[PDB]
Amino acid sequence: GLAEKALKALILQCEENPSLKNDKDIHIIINTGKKMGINRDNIPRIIPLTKYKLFKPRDLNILLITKDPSALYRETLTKDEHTSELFKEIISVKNLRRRFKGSKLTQLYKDFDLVVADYRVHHLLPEVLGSRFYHGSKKLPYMIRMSKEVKLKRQQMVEKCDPIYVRAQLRSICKNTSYIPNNDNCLSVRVGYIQKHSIPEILQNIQDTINFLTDKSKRPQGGVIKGGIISIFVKTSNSTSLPIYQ
RNA sequence: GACGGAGCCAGCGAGCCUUGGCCGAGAGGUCUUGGUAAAAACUCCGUCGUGC
RNA sequence: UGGGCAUAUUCCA
Known part of the structure; x- marks a missing residue:
């Protein structure tokens, strides 16, 4: 598959490069087709994850x-x-x-x-x-x-x-976990954490992130963006933007 | 001697480096990320009691 | 008429 092959070499990339050995958080970066619309709430807003604990x-x-x-x-x-x-x-x-x-x-x-x-x-x-x-x-x-x-x-x-x-x-x-609304194209959410999950738990974290994030009911705090996403990249803190969807 | 609260008075004045996306030939903008850097006194109330 | 907190007011002199 597209995701899990890129996740295996990422986990192998963790245990080999000392710049990556000291940062345990995993983010995702979302290219949307246009800018989101609103900015500077400076308030996080939480997604209901449906399968498994973070902390x-x-x-x-x-x-x-x-x-x-x-x-x-x-x-x-x-x-x-x-x-x-x-x-x-x-x-x-x-x-x-x-x-x-x-x-x-x-x-x-x-x-x-x-x-x-x-x-x-x-x-x-x-x-x-x-x-x-x-x-x-x-x-x-x-x-x-x-x-x-x-x-x-x-x-x-x-x-x-x-x-x-x-x-x-x-x-x-x-x-x-939660996210930060802003008025740009890119959008990052921490979804993963090493030595605490498997690969398909992360896959369901990402698919759930598309579930709550592209909620077309136009709800306040639920499904803000429109117009469909371009691509999703994955990086921890200094690893490259490895794509899953393009 | 600590610890933690609560109380409360004045005068001289304005009188820093990174990771990565998007757009843009480009100049550049626009963001997401990591680390490092930068009144007092007093009053009373409660807990503990000596190591170079 | 003058001060306080909240940011069709309220309390105080």
Whole structure:
């Protein structure tokens, strides 16, 4: 087949070249026939994968930020045994600006691999979080909810942290992967990870990626592009653009 | 002596290198990626107690 | 009439 022959020599290409030996993420690059249309949401959006896990909250570090009072919410998730392990560190921004300003910032994505923040206080992350975090892997913080619905028409309503819900979408972001909308021709999605899958699991990851990505129901967040794709290339971090479809 | 919170006062001022796609003869643009580089003090509240 | 948070207002003097 077209794909799996190009994947075998890619996996052999991993274990022979030391520039490729140190980068374990696998991306795909999508040439679309025209440009996509919209840009600079700076928000990832998640695809529902239908077969197999990528990661789980046991295995990695999870980091949370909120608005004042953070002391009200930093106790609830650790006084429940379901969610006490599901995070590593929990603060607000107002500690975060004075804890790690500037030169310590290089050890941020060294010491972490997933960042999440409250939906209210997301719109100022790259200011205090720093420019150098962008955009080397294009890892970016995620947006979740702290409770159920709070409406805001004419009354000023308080909310309480519901831990089982945080557990519910927090388990939901680990099994899947996401993507970044932009206004260009090319589009990259990490879909593969070495020593954790087989080849046809990756084949179903790619065929599922075409399933959700070319959803013709014109749904918000579901099937954005139109007009059909040109080609799909595969590279890890420094390997060449090896095609599957042309 | 640590650790972690919460409290809170001022004055001098504006008064950097990479991987790859798409278009373009080209000049170049347009992006996706990896690494390296850049108030304090104090007040109180709770946990632990000496190694060159 | 003057300040605060949210970004047919609301609270305070």
